[PDB]
């Protein structure tokens, strides 16, 4: 697949490359309006680092929650989606609600896990 | 081998005057570090006489018998540079010639990469 | 004690056989080569650190130990034949001359 | 079996260059607002003592290609440039001037200042003035009464800003985060090859922008015996740092009282220039103790001795020649330029086996920076009084070339190229990159839980 | 021992001392060219940490991987190693392993431990 | 302002395209003033 090469395979094969996708510029890595624009990608980078951070994702390239996948929202069979179908067109089917999706990861995992941990420990 | 355009030749008087002198383009002139001079006996090997700095003018002559008897100077916004020798003797007849060094790093030597095609002075009778 | 001197000086060639003069000086130092042909201003051979000059055309070559220096011309071509001169800073040797 | 290990933070560094921070003295600039070296603002000294001896540590020096004086240098003439641009722009100013000798004059027949007038343009573009005020020979060229500045063939001759003072300021230069700089520890060091022992510090300290041509003025004083520092030692063309152990002090002052005028030349276009002078006029001049200055070559000489051999004859000698900023001791003394004749200090030959050197002086008000073609600066005069005092901490020596029938050697003054200033303070330093990403074998097999 | 004491110390010894190091300006924080000066600090420290992120090792000071050393890279004692030589002298002795090693980490461990585990997530 | 007429004693190729014109110049003295002759082509100069 290669850089580039992994966005037009299944969703599935894709995940071989997601280091690779990392690599190359994804993470905003620089190798005066030159300046904005290296201060810009750094933005981006970070930004989307803490939403991992809020998820209890950091540190991962695949991460799962306890929210239920909504169904509804997408309309197919498990492996139709894996193998049957590339992330470009996936990201259009569950585009509408993702606000949604992004709240419950909050929610429905992390302020609760968080909270049942610290009863946990004290 | 970019060439200098040099000066013209002539015939002097035991102890007249005479500038040499040569001439280049500013985007030749401005890369060089040192202007040298040396000369060309007949039956003799190359004999090195001094150079001038082509930013601050400080000269630096090898024997004391052309430091008395030569001296050196330059012109940075003619991209120019002049030799004027006085107490011509009939033992200074030789070929004279201009040339140049660009090396600005120490431990790599002189080099002169640039010569002009030189002049003949003659002292006589 | 003369700074800069060359051997073996004058000396008759063959074209096809690779060629080879000499020099040494005192204390240590780069040293240079330059060619003369009569009525010309001489050229740049071998930059001092025994690189090749630019501008010529892959026939030399040389390497140093001590206080020696060693210039070789590729297979003793006539267009070569010309006056020799090592230079140390300052001075000039004597010269060499190829004939044949 | 062995395995594979990461280790984040390890002390490791390499050589690079960076840009480095300005930093200086915020007190200094409270004294003076407008201070071209002081600037608006800038990092704090950062005094603070250093943490690091790096023992056991050693590595290779090489001043010669230490960048820091790139930097230096660069920001030194943009700093400059920087604060003349709101400058009253006197380029209206050249033209005829006619003229003759001052007269009625009380004298010190010296031919160093004239007294001339020309026609200046005014507030109106209708009407004209007459200047008068007086001129130094150096600063004007025949074009025999007719006169023009010497520089008005050049782009432009503007006014040093009247509120702008020049006075030299300590620079520090600070490390980016990430990066360090290191300082060498040993004692009497060559500023190049190995250094047996090396420290650590965030910052420079002590350098000043101080300018100056054949001796350096106010620099660091070698920590034992006087140094002899190169690039090469035969290659003439190389200048020589002396690097004294011990200043030489030196007394310079200025005559007498010379008054200001200021003329108006254009709307609100000040333009100052030199009125008449109250009582006798004296050249200008400088006095070096004779025993200090004897004393201290001798130690230069020892020095030189030890590449030459001692069966060695040292002399020393004045200029060969070249432009006046190399021919001549050159330096700013209260906002004044002065050139001074320093053939009297350098009169002399060494052979192995309350009195005082007065140096006279000249003074122009054109000066060009940097050996910069087509640019000048006009210094507005200072108000008659010129007291000072200074440390001549070392020489920028040259050899004389050439083949010898003896044992003789011969030295100079020479250079003029300011980047030499600079690595006399420079040398001392390093600038590398700290790399934290480093690999080391372990018995652990990272053992994993599912 | 302070920013870089260690280097005059063992490489075992010198681990003691790596949250000083990090500390030490390595995060790039400051207590147009000093700007530009800013940003690439900031650059630089966050290329590291993707490269730990990449390798799983985020987070910690020191990691281990199941990826086995070559003895041939250094053909020293483990002893040796850590006991006679300084971090300096080893970054020397090891510098041109760094892109095999590198490729290694990411592509033997860390994306084949979060495959695997994903598997057992299934 | 420029007085002037069209180019005489040339070779040429009457072809209006140049002009050789001469005005009083400014020199590096307000005082003085210069004679600069030189040519001009039709396009870039008006009556
Ligand atoms: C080597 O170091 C010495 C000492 O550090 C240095 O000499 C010093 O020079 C400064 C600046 O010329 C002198 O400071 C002056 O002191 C007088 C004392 O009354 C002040 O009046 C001066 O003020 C002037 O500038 C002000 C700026 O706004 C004006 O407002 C004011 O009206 C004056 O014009 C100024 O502060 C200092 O006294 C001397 N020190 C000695 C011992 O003379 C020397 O110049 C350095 N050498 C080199 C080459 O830099
Ligand atoms: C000024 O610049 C000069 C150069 O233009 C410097 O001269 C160099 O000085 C060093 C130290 O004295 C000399 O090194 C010596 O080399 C000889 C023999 O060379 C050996 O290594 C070469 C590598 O290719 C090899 O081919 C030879 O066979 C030898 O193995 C040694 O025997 C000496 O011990 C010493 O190492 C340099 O040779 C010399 N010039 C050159 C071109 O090497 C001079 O020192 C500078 N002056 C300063 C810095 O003050
Ligand atoms: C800017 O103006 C200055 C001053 O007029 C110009 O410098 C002058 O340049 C001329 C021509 O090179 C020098 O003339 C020489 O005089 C000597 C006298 O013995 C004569 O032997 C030479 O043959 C030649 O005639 C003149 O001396 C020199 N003036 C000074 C004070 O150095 C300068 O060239 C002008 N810059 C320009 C036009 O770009
Ligand atoms: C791009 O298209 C080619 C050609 O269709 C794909 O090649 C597939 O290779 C695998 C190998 O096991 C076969 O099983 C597939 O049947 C081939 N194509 C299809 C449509 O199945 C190649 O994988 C495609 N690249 C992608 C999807 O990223
Ligand atoms: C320079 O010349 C001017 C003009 O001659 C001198 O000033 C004049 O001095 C006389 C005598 O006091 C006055 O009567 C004139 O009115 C003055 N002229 C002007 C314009 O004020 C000036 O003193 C001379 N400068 C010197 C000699 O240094
Ligand atoms: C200013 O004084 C100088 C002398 O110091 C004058 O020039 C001299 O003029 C006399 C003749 O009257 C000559 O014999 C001298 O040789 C000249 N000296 C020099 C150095 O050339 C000068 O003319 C006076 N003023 C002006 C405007 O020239
Ligand atoms: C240069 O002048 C200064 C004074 O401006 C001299 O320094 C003073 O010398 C006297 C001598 O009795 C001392 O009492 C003062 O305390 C000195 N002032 C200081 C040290 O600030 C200086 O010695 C003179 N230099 C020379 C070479 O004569
Ligand atoms: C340099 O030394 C000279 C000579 O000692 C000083 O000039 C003397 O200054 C005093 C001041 O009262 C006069 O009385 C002497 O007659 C002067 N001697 C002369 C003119 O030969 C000079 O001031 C000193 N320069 C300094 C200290 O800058
Ligand atoms: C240099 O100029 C200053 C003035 O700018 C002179 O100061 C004068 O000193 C006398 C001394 O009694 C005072 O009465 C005057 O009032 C001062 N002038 C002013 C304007 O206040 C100083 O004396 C001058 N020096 C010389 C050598 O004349
Ligand atoms: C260096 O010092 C000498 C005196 O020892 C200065 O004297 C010059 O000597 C030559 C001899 O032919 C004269 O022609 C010159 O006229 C003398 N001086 C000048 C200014 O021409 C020599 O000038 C000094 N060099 C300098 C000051 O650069
Ligand atoms: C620099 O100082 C030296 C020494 O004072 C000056 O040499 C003088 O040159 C003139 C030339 O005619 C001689 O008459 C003097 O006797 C020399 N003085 C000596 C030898 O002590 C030299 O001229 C000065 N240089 C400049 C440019 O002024
Ligand atoms: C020239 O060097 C001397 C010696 O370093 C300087 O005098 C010292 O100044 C410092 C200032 O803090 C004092 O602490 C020292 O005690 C002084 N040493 C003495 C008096 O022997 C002198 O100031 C320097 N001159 C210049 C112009 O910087
Ligand atoms: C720098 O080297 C010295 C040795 O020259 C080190 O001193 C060590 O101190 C420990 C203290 O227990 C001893 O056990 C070691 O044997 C000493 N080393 C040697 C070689 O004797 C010093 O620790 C080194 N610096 C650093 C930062 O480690
Ligand atoms: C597993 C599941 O029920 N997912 C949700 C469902 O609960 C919700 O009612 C519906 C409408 O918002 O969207 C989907
Ligand atoms: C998955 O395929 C089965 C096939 O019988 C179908 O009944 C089911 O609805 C599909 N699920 C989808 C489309 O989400
Ligand atoms: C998303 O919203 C747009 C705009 O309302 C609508 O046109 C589209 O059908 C929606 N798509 C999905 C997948 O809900
Ligand atoms: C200065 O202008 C006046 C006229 O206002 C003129 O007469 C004079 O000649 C000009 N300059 C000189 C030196 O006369
Ligand atoms: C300077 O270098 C020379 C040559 O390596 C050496 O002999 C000399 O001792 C060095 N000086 C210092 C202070 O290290
Ligand atoms: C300098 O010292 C030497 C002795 O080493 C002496 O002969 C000479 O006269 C002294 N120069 C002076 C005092 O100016
Ligand atoms: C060790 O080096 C050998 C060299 O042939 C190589 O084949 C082997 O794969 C290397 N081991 C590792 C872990 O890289
Ligand atoms: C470690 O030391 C032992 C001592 O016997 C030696 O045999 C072995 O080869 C060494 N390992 C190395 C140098 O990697
Ligand atoms: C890296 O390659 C160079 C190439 O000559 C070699 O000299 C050096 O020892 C090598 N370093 C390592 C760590 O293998
Ligand atoms: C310069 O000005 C004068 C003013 O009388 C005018 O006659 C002349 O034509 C102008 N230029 C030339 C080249 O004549």
């Known amino acids: 697949l290669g850089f580039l090469g992994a966005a037009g395979s299944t969703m599935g094969a894709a995940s071989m490359t997601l280091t690779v996708q990392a690599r190359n510029l994804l993470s905003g890595i620089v190798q005066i309006k030159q300046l904005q624009a290296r201060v810009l990608a750094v933005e981006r980078y970070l930004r989307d680092q803490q939403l991992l951070g809020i998820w209890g994702c950091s540190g991962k390239l695949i991460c799962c929650t306890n929210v239920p996948w909504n169904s509804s929202w997408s309309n197919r069979n498990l492996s139709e989606i894996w193998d049957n179908m590339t992330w470009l067109q996936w990201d259009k089917e569950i585009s509408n609600y993702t606000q949604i999706i992004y709240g419950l990861l909050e929610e429905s995992q992390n302020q609760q896990e968080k909270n049942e941990q610290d009863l946990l420990a004290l | 081998q970019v060439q200098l355009v040099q000066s013209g030749s002539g015939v002097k008087k035991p102890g007249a005057s005479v500038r040499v002198s040569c001439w280049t383009s500013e985007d030749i002139f401005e890369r060089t570090e040192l202007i040298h001079w040396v000369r060309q006996a007949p039956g003799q090997g190359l004999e090195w006489i001094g150079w001038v700095k082509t930013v601050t003018g400080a000269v630096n002559f090898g024997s004391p018998d052309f430091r008395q008897r030569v001296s050196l100077t330059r012109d940075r916004d003619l991209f120019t540079a002049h030799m004027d020798i006085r107490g011509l003797t009939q033992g200074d007849t030789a070929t004279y010639f201009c040339?140049?060094?660009?090396?600005?790093?120490?431990?790599?030597?002189?080099?002169?990469?640039?010569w002009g095609r030189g002049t003949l002075i003659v002292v006589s009778s | 004690e003369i700074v800069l001197t060359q051997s073996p000086g004058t000396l008759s060639l063959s074209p096809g056989e690779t060629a080879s003069l000499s020099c040494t000086a005192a204390?240590?130092?780069?040293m240079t080569w330059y060619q003369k042909k009569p009525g010309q201003p001489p050229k740049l051979l071998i930059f001092?650190?025994?690189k090749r000059a630019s501008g010529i055309p892959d026939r030399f070559s040389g390497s140093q130990f001590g206080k020696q220096y060693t210039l070789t011309i590729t297979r003793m071509e006539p267009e070569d034949f010309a006056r020799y001169y090592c230079?140390?800073?300052?001075?000039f040797g004597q010269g060499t001359r190829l004939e044949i | 079996n062995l395995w594979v290990t990461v280790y984040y933070g390890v002390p490791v560094w390499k050589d690079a260059e960076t840009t480095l921070f300005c930093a200086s003295d915020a007190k200094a600039y409270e004294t003076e607002k407008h201070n071209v070296w002081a600037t608006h603002a800038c990092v704090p000294t950062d005094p603070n003592p250093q943490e690091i001896h790096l023992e056991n540590v050693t590595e290779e020096f090489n001043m010669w290609k230490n960048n820091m004086v790139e930097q230096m240098h660069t920001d030194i003439i943009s700093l400059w440039d920087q604060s003349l641009k709101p400058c009253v722009k006197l380029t209206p100013l050249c033209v005829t001037l006619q003229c003759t000798n001052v007269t009625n004059a009380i004298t010190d027949m010296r031919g160093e200042l004239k007294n001339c007038s020309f026609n200046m343009t005014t507030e109106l573009r209708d009407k004209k003035q007459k200047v008068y005020s007086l001129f130094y020979r150096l600063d004007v060229v025949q074009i025999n009464k007719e006169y023009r500045l010497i520089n008005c063939n050049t782009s432009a001759i503007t006014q040093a800003c009247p509120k702008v003072s020049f006075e030299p300021i300590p620079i520090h230069y600070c490390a980016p985060a990430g990066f360090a700089i290191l300082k060498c520890k040993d004692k009497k060091f060559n500023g190049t090859g190995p250094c047996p022992s090396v420290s650590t510090v965030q910052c420079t300290h002590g350098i000043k922008p101080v300018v100056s041509t054949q001796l350096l003025l106010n620099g660091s004083l070698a920590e034992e015996e006087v140094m002899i520092r190169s690039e090469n030692i035969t290659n003439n063309a190389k200048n020589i740092l002396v690097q004294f152990n011990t200043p030489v002090q030196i007394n310079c002052t200025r005559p007498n009282n010379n008054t200001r005028k200021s003329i108006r030349i254009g709307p609100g276009q000040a333009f100052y220039a030199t009125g008449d002078i109250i009582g006798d006029i004296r050249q200008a001049h400088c006095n070096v103790s004779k025993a200090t200055w004897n004393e201290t070559l001798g130690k230069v000489v020892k020095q030189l001795r030890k590449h030459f051999g001692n069966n060695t004859i040292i002399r020393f000698a004045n200029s060969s020649g070249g432009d006046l900023e190399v021919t001549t001791h050159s330096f700013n003394c209260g906002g004044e330029f002065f050139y001074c004749n320093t053939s009297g200090l350098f009169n002399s030959t060494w052979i192995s086996n309350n009195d005082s050197i007065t140096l006279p002086c000249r003074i122009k008000q054109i000066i060009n920076m940097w050996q910069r073609i087509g640019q000048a600066m006009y210094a507005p005069p200072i108000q008659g009084v010129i007291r000072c005092v200074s440390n001549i901490t070392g020489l920028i020596l040259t050899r004389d070339g050439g083949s010898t029938n003896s044992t003789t050697e011969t030295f100079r003054p020479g250079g003029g190229d300011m980047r030499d200033n600079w690595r006399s303070e420079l040398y001392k330093y390093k600038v590398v990159k700290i790399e934290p990403l480093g690999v080391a074998p372990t018995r652990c097999k990272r053992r994993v839980v599912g | 021992l302070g920013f870089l004491g260690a280097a005059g110390s063992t490489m075992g010894a010198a681990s003691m001392t790596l949250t000083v190091q990090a500390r030490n300006l390595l995060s790039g924080i400051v207590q147009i060219k000093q700007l530009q000066a800013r940003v690439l600090a900031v650059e630089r420290y966050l290329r590291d940490q993707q490269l730990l992120g990449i390798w799983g090792c985020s987070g910690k000071l020191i990691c281990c991987t199941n990826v086995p050393w070559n003895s041939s890279w250094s053909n020293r004692n483990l002893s040796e190693i850590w006991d006679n030589m300084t971090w300096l002298q080893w970054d020397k002795e090891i510098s041109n392993y760094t892109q095999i090693i590198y490729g290694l980490l990411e592509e033997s461990q860390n994306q084949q431990e979060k495959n695997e585990q994903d598997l057992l997530a299934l | 302002t420029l007085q002037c007429t069209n180019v005489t004693n040339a070779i040429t190729d009457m072809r209006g395209e140049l002009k050789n014109c001469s005005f009083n110049m400014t020199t590096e003295l307000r005082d003085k003033k210069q004679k600069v002759y030189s040519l001009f082509y039709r396009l870039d100069v008006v009556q």
């Open positions: 230079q140390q800073l300052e001075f």
């Open positions: 040339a140049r060094q660009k090396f600005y790093t120490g431990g790599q030597g002189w080099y002169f990469d640039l």
């Open positions: 204390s240590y130092g780069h």
């Open positions: 001092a650190t025994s």
